[PDB]
């Protein structure tokens, strides 16, 4: 599609369509793109005095990129409610992306007074990295996605990446990418850009909670035909003697029944309380944290493998670094109080996954004998074993959607730990840049590269449409289920609306696990 | 101002050597350094650190 | 072709066929092949105390190779006489090679007594380097070709090559070739090996001498219409004055005529006499030699660019290193007297090429004026100029035939300086080797490579057939020409025959330039 100056190159599409087992969400936003880095590539690195854990080396490019990797970019709160109250699972199917109504504007800063004017002949460059040749920076939970509220205008974030480093320096293996070394399409006002994408096959996300516990799967009315060791000594005349005795497990001793499965793996975290007085009076945010050690550096495990946030009757507690934490509206960046953030809770999976702040279990450490008593120890970290079952972390209305699976020789259960769908060929990155326009050149030749350009930026509309496949529930449960609902009581503001000043805000995080399912 | 593009097709002549021991190849050094060769610096200046010829493979006379 | 033990795998073909403008020469010899290097590859290098000019580095292989790069491998003396007395030129056209009647024999050295027996199951490996991937060692005038006399049995020479060196050591660029890394055909007694080859287009070798001189091409009866400066001063009253005068050249001043061409290039050599008393009493064999300087080494120029050996009435002289020198029968290897060698003569080309031991000419060095006399200097080395003509070095019955043109970016008039045909794709090298047969191994496993083999060698017949294209003479000369002939007078032995002991010998070298041609 291409036409003149006075022709819109696209329309505004924003709604959702529910049809059978599909739902199609399309959203449109308006964006603004500045000139980053003053048209330059720049090597960046960590500060000289930074600790060894915080060293890095990389580059920052003059390009921007579009990002729609959060659920609230596509679902309204009402649409999210429809989804989570009536379906056991969902997954993305295909995607459509469109960029249109481009406007480039030049700025003049004469005498502290700014004048903005159209530049009808300038252009912007766009290309999609459909072969995954650039370092993939999506899927790191960065800011700069499409806004949740359709009436908001957002700035396009700048592209940059990191490569191998040795302290603050680079090594011979580190690679540098010039994004101008890709074929890209140049658009003037009156051109548009589209492409399509098909998701690979992925398992449905489990939008349910189990109505049974992994340790409670037996018939409570019938005993087992297997025996377990129930007593190791028996009373003799005024004393005891070693004597093995066996029993069949029933309901009275349900903890001893033979079982076929084991809970999911574990990697223990430290426990903190939402009540301030319960926590220790010290700085253990890093010393008491759970981390992994890679190439001599320590890195915080956050949020880590999916484990239950707490056991029953203990909502006040949560793992130190084991849950997603969103910020309330207009909360700051650094060292905000607990009233400014929204802490998620993964308690629905405590039917199969162990609690994040307890041990996995206990194993024996010695060989008991006539003169040696049996000894056990706690297991604070347990890799996977044959016979384990577990659930993955839940997804949230304002959480990520997908993540690119790293191209490696091996990987196990490649669902991203922050939640979502792991894809070997995720939706490609979409890079965009204003073409530089040089200022008045000299009338005598000079071989030095240009350094004076016309100050300008661009704006336009972006739209993205995604088809999702649904998995309807088929429960024979008799009593009603738990549903997500709004409270009826009066209040100064309605949730998920704007306030008197025009600020849209999301008052709480919303998971997906409300319906139930048998184990 | 504007854009300019140039595309060139080159014909290659593949080597067909029966040499046993490995050859000399152009390579980057692995050791650490403040900047990577043939990249930009912290100010955005691209630079080529050395001239590179073409004669690395070998042939009998 | 393949058959049993009691079947000859080929016949003996040895004769020549003359038909029109073609001549087909086929020859057969019997060869013997030992086991070289005791089945090993070995790095070889120059001695530690050798001078810098004599340093080298390379390898010696356990392979042999067949070589038929001398004319007397194909032409009998009588056939050579037919060729050179009736043709103005010739060149090779195509080639056929055959190896047959292989016999492998094992040697036992018990108690100083040698016993030789057939080994019917052992084999030999043969392959032709038809893609020129090995270093080409033919064309260096080495010994080991097929013998000139068909009744002689010859030993196959060993293959070896040199690569880049730095003094006595190697460099990273030097290359090593394993000949077992080629596909080769394995022959038992009863198998044979053949292949064919087509020569590329090359100019005919000039089998004539010019009957005119380059400086004598005018009509001696008619003057020129051009003028030359004949006198620069004229007599005045009892004195002279500068005054230019011009004349038309005729027969009386034939040296001054204007001409269209120039003699061939030059690279001056030192002159020595066959009479011992005429030469200086000193050792100037290296100090007085003409050499070229390559990578800090000096190398003797031998024989160098084709120049006449001497001027008329001076047969006693010859350039120090400017002629091919063959040895008489049974002459030694080192420091033999002049009576033991046969020195060739290139006097037939003094009609166009300058004499090797004189200057090319003289050129002026200054600007004469009223108070400065003109000065000239001799030119001892002259590169090619537009308008030069020259002849190439003659070929001889016992000289080389072809040489491989080095694969380089540039080359000028690529006819090999020792004489013959320069080919970009010469006849390929033919490598041959006895397959090693291990001796009695140990009955307990050992990972060390084998070092004890059965002593054995091989023998058989080899035949080569070459078609040559002739260029018949078409002269209108009235008086008879010079022909190569035998002397009629009595003698103890006939030339090119065997003596009373059975030794075949060639008494003199025989060129090709007997017929004449106009310039």
From TrEMBL, chain B:
Where found, per UniProt? Virion
UniProt record similarity statement: Belongs to the parvoviridae capsid protein family.
**What is this protein identified as?**
Capsid protein VP1
Query: Which gene carries the instructions for this protein?
Result: cap
Boundaries of the shown chain within the full protein:
675 to 735 of 735
